[PDB]
Design an enzyme around this catalytic site. Sequence first.
Site, PDB file in Angstrom:
ATOM      1  N   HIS A 288       0.884  -1.197   0.000  1.00 47.11           N
ATOM      2  CA  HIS A 288       0.000   0.000   0.000  1.00 47.11           C
ATOM      3  C   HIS A 288       0.908   1.230   0.000  1.00 47.11           C
ATOM      4  O   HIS A 288       2.015   1.152   0.610  1.00 47.11           O
ATOM      5  CB  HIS A 288      -1.029  -0.011   1.144  1.00 47.11           C
ATOM      6  CG  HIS A 288      -0.465   0.037   2.523  1.00 47.11           C
ATOM      7  ND1 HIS A 288      -0.661  -0.987   3.428  1.00 47.11           N
ATOM      8  CD2 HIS A 288       0.245   0.979   3.173  1.00 47.11           C
ATOM      9  CE1 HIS A 288      -0.086  -0.687   4.574  1.00 47.11           C
ATOM     10  NE2 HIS A 288       0.481   0.513   4.444  1.00 47.11           N
TER      11      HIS A 288
ATOM     12  N   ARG B 184      -5.216  20.358  13.983  1.00 44.77           N
ATOM     13  CA  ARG B 184      -4.066  19.732  13.298  1.00 44.77           C
ATOM     14  C   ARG B 184      -3.378  20.781  12.410  1.00 44.77           C
ATOM     15  O   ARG B 184      -3.423  20.643  11.171  1.00 44.77           O
ATOM     16  CB  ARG B 184      -4.540  18.484  12.550  1.00 44.77           C
ATOM     17  CG  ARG B 184      -3.395  17.586  12.104  1.00 44.77           C
ATOM     18  CD  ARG B 184      -3.894  16.465  11.234  1.00 44.77           C
ATOM     19  NE  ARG B 184      -4.496  17.031  10.026  1.00 44.77           N
ATOM     20  CZ  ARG B 184      -5.235  16.348   9.155  1.00 44.77           C
ATOM     21  NH1 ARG B 184      -5.484  15.064   9.370  1.00 44.77           N
ATOM     22  NH2 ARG B 184      -5.719  16.949   8.079  1.00 44.77           N
TER      23      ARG B 184
END
Length: 597
Positions: free
Chosen positions: A35, A528
């Site tokens: 991945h 964030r």
Amino acid sequence: MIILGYNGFSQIAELFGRLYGYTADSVDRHSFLGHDAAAALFVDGELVAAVEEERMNRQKKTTAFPANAMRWCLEQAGISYEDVDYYAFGWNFTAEFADAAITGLASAPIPPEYKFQAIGSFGELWNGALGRTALIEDFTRHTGYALPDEKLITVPHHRAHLACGRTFSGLGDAAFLINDGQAEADSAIMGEVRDGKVEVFERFTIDAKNSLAQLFANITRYLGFTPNNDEYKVMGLAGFGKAPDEQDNPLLTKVVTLEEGGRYSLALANDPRGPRAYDPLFDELFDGNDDNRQEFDFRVRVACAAQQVIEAVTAHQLRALAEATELRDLIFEGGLALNCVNNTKLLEELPFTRVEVSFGASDPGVSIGAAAHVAREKSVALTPTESPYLGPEFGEDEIRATLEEYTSSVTWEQLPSDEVVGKTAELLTGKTVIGWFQGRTEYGPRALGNRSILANPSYADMKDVINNRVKHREPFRPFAPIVLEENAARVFEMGRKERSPYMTFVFPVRPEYTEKIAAATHVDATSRIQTVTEDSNPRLAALLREFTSRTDVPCLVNTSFNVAGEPIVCSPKDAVECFLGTDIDHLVIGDFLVSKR
């Protein structure tokens, strides 16, 4: 001189689909390795190009051979496969690995006489996936260039997770923690970098079957999500909950044992039923039936418990590392460094004065790191780099080219840069959800203002309005703000950080700015953040300053420019197709302020 790092196995998809029932439509689609297949190019100890196949092939977290990313990386340098002095992989599947695997599967306390089915598939993996011969085959067949065995260096994953960290940390000497999930045989390693040399303390190493990352992956699946793609929803959920005491945390009592020497083990780590073995235990520990398991108050509780084990364990780990080195600069890399909430806890509650987590803390980064690991061993003096803007870029005409193929669908006006900025700002004055296409394609999971959807965070509704127009409503996914570094101190409780340009850390919001930027904030009063400068992203810095000057709002919202399940838009086409399959109000791509008709 020249090194190309990559990740990818053309067949692992069909292999894992067939042999292990991990079909592209399963919740386990992203839960086998390879991945975040990507390519990366160092020339003379300088990173000149990097893109992830997912940006090119358009398939999120792809495991494909990085055909498109490799070509593009070589074309960016006007070089060819033959010119490339070396090829780095970022998986060291050595012959000695397989044996301990074939050997180990043989010593299975649950022999069904189908240790064959097991050994047989791991062979089908080895002969078409993990094998050196299988890599040279796969490369040769997809590249056309015939990978000489002499040019291929297979780098241990973690030594690449780290090599990535080291390329971006700005540090010199430093301790390191690698907590990743999928790995060769070890799930987590620790050690230090002293006088440019890597030394791993073997005493702190953790096997692959006691994966803290996997535990978090199994929680993400249990609660009705994708185990190795969407753990952010647990971190997100965890924010609606009050953490329980570590004594009453069923995951710290019956699953996770904190052993002396900064070590730990998981119950059911040998259970043959595989990772799915734990599903029945959480049911007991958390009182889960089929009706309650995907309900908010229950999810928040499993997430709260799960969120703490990560913070608890990793703390337990690094407090041991602290007593093992005097170095107070950390490199944190691996899956578990995607937990930006914990990352900031490790920084503020532990003796390390600098924790550093890259945009490639994730696996895409093993492709860059593979090459950096090789580059250093070769005395290739590494040029320090801090930019994630490493991928494809588009020119005036290429955009005008694609904007002629959609004239029936959209109008535009090419502007001067100083006014592309100004107009977008007045648009962001009102409630606009705009798309920002600029510069080279940011590497890694999170968008950092080259392929971003911007919006004003001061509008009371904005969270719903973005979710409604971007078509990607994520109930538990908080939005994040961009802020000029020069304002971060005043707007956020920045603690021991001056800057955070990669949204790998989460900071509390000073309650003097909390109303103005509330759509870029969680219920945690957390955010964030992405620090921006005229050096990091000149055009995003231009935009921010102007919008602030008009609105008196210190932050914009920076959310990924994609549709649901789709990776981040790479090309102008990619952007325009997203624009038109959403209700984004305008696209700014290059110097074109695009509007719909």
